[PDB]
Amino acid sequence: GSSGSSGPMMPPVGVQASILSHDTIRITWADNSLPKHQKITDSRYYTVRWKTNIPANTKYKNANATTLSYLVTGLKPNTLYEFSVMVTKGRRSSTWSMTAHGTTFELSGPSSG
Numbered sequence: 001g002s003s004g005s006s007g008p009m010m011p012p013v014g015v016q017a018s019i020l021s022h023d024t025i026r027i028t029w030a031d032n033s034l035p036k037h038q039k040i041t042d043s044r045y046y047t048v049r050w051k052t053n054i055p056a057n058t059k060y061k062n063a064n065a066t067t068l069s070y071l072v073t074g075l076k077p078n079t080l081y082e083f084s085v086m087v088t089k090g091r092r093s094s095t096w097s098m099t100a101h102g103t104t105f106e107l108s109g110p111s112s113g
Contacts, residue, residue: 012097022105040068044066046086
């Protein structure tokens with residue numbers, strides 16, 4: 001993809017999804033770019049995207065929140081969803097970090113028996 005000449009922004013890490021509820025998930029990550037202390041003193045913003053696995057192809061949804069984390073809500077129960085956190089500084093940006101798959105809990109519930 002790139003020999004080295006170029007040098008676009010680098011994607012975040014530690015991208016993980018913490019299933020709390022049927023429509024609640026925690027998306028925390030890290031930015032090796034940040035200085036010693038974990039504090040975004042820069043004027044940037046993070047954009048986390050997420051979509052459904054069915055149908056395979058579906059409009060990719062994204063949000064806007066400047067932080068090293070993100071709490072997704074309004075999702076569907078027992079449904080496969082994607083998650084990716086990237087960094088953008090206006091003109092420059094980084095690819096989509098390791099797409100973490102988070103399967104929420106079942107809402108409907110089991111049947112009598």
